[PDB]
Amino acid sequence: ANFENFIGATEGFSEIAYQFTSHILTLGYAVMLAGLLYFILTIKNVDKKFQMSNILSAVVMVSAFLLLYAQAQNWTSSFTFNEEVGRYFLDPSGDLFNNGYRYLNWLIDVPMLLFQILFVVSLTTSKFSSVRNQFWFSGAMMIITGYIGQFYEVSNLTAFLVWGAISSAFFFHILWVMKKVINEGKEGISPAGQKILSNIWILFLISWTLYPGAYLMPYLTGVDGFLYSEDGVMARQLVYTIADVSSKVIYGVLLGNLAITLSKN
């Protein structure tokens, strides 16, 4: 199937690759539940006019909590310890590790995260429905072609890369539209608000680039290097979790800070 199962069937997992990776994925859904509460309780602090951004954050938190909970559980129960050999191995009496929970969660989140900035900032010369449509279309293709090529991770590498590139194309379109949004949204807001918009742009830039980095990570040091081990598994799932916290939680915190700042009139 995927590179995690491959390693879990050929080599196996040490006790600290398995446990660390169970612990990092558990932290990841724990944060989403703490986010959920943060976004509900804070709705009171922003004018009715920006509150839709909180609403959307809350819904993203709900979706990610549940699906990343499934992903966590799909990791713990996929491997079992062989006390003879001392490593954790893929369990044939199991469901086998599956990235589908995470990809599904991106597909749901991607329109809400992109749409929500458009309730905090104003466009100038661009049309609202035009930005929305471009966002929703290319965000969905990006995740789907990201998902297709992920089935060929271990089997066919050339496909894994060509599909991953097809998914980069859509990714970069999104970065174009977002940069445009952020420029127009800077016009006629305060210097404080403009500061926060610039922070949002950099956080959105780093955090979303982590994801194709995590896609490639097992092959980053070549088809026989350091990362082509259970360490690319640890690194891949550490990067995904950082990217989930940054693109979903931190992003919407910054947007809520931008909204409050915009109630200074």
Ligand X SMILES: *C\C=C(C)/C=C/C=C(C)/C=C/C1=C(C)CCCC1(C)C
Query: With CB under 6 A as the contact rule, which of the stretches 25-33, 37-45, 217-225, 244-252 interacts with ligand X?
Result: 244-252
For 223, the 3-state DSSP assignment is coil
Nearest to 90 by CA among 24, 7, 152, 15: 7
Whole-angstrom Cα Rg for the chain: 20
Length in residues, the chain: 265
Enter the tokens of residue 147. Answer: 């998902």
CB of 47 to ligand X, least distance (A): 26
What does 116 interact with, of ligand X, ligand LFA, none (CB < 5 to 8 A by kind)?
A: none
Kindly tell me which of 34 and 192 has the beta carbon lying closer to ligand X.
34
Instruction: Name which of residues 45 to 84 contact ligand X (CB under 6 A).
Output: none
Q: Measured between alpha carbons, how far is 220 from 226 in angstroms, rounded to an integer?
A: 9
In the complex, residue closest to ligand LFA by CB: 100
Nearest to 235 by CA among 49, 7, 1: 7
Query: With CB under 6 A as the contact rule, which of the stretches 15-23, 119-127, 182-190, 236-244 interacts with ligand LFA?
Result: 236-244
Between the CA of residue 106 and those of 15, 20, 114, 153, what are the distances in Å?
30, 23, 12, 19
Element (H, E) at 151: helix 128-151
Nearest to 58 by CA among 252, 201, 196: 252
CB of 19 to ligand LFA, least distance (A): 17
Site string for ligand LFA, 129-158 (x = CB under 6 A): --------------xx--x-----------
Q: Binding ligand LFA by CB under 6 A: which of 100, 141, 182, 229?
A: 100
35 sits near ligand X (criterion: CB under 6 A): no
Nearest to 57 by CA among 109, 134, 131: 109
Instruction: Name which of residues 164 to 183 contact ligand X (CB under 6 A).
Output: 164, 167-168, 171
Neighbours of 101 (CB within 10 A): 18
Nearest to 209 by CA among 180, 239, 237, 234: 239
CB of 260 to ligand X, least distance (A): 24
Query: Which segments within the chain are labelled E, that is strand?
Result: 79-81, 88-90
CB of 142 to ligand X, least distance (A): 6
Q: What are the two backbone dihedrals, phi and then psi, of residue 175, each rounded to the nearest 5 degrees?
A: -60, -35
Binding residues for ligand X, per CB under 6 A? 106, 109-110, 113, 142-143, 146, 164, 167-168, 171, 208, 211-212, 215, 244, 247-248
Binding residues for ligand LFA, per CB under 6 A? 30-31, 34-35, 37-38, 41-42, 59, 62-63, 66-67, 70, 98, 100-101, 103-104, 107-108, 111-112, 115, 143-144, 147, 168, 196, 199, 203, 206-207, 209, 212-213, 235, 238-239, 242, 245-246, 249-250, 253-254, 257
